[PDB]
Amino acid sequence: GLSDGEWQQVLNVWGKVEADIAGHGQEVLIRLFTGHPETLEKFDKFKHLKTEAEMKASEDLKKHGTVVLTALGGILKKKGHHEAELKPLAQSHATKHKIPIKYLEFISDAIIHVLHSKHPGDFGADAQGAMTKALELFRNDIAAKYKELGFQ
Numbered sequence: 798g799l800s801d802g803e804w805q806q807v808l809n810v811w812g813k814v815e816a817d818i819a820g821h822g823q824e825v826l827i828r829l830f831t832g833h834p835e836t837l838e839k840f841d842k843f844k845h846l847k848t849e850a851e852m853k854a855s856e857d858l859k860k861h862g863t864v865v866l867t868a869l870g871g872i873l874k875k876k877g878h879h880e881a882e883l884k885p886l887a888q889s890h891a892t893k894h895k896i897p898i899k900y901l902e903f904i905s906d907a908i909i910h911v912l913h914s915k916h917p918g919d920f921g922a923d924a925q926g927a928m929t930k931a932l933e934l935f936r937n938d939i940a941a942k943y944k945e946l947g948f949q
């Protein structure tokens with residue numbers, strides 16, 4: 798449950814991401830994969846990436862980063878009214894990709910890390926609070942769908 802002012806902060810922060818969705822998406826995934834190498838194993842199409850240099854050079858990783866952040870941005874712009882947008886992602890990530898909710902926590906924190914890394918001094922405490930709450934809401938609603946599906 799975010800206030801109007803918190804959603805305003807979220808969407809203000811998101812404008813930073815939308816200016817360079819592929820660069821943000823790439824860095825989010827690289828942060829996820831390098832911080833939590835087990836997550837790489839969930840991607841048949843990225844498990845060949847042995848080094849961060851290879852990850853950085855991967856155009857397909859940037860492409861997927863764009864897909865991920867485009868989806869997330871579409872969800873965030875719903876300001877919590879995202880059941881229709883979230884449902885297929887929860888279902889695909891539980892049933893097809895088999896992504897534990899822990900990895901969604903990892904990527905949520907990776908987003909925060911990337912925002913500070915790319916916008917140092919420009920991702921204020923209020924913005925971090927609002928973005929964190931929005932990612933918690935996202936993760937929590939996914940978690941509810943995971944529970945429905947019995948997925949761990």
Ligand code: HEM
Nearest residue numbers: 836839840842864865868869885886889894896900901904
């Ligand atoms: C912000 C959180 C995430 C968003 C918005 C997101 C979004 C997406 C989207 C839109 C797709 C393609 C459509 C689909 O298959 O449903 C996808 C595919 C996929 N996602 Fe995610 N995802 C997120 C987090 C994760 C995490 C944390 C993992 C694993 C650690 C993961 C693993 C995968 C895999 C393996 C695929 C299939 C990739 C392929 O083979 O093309 N996702 N994701």
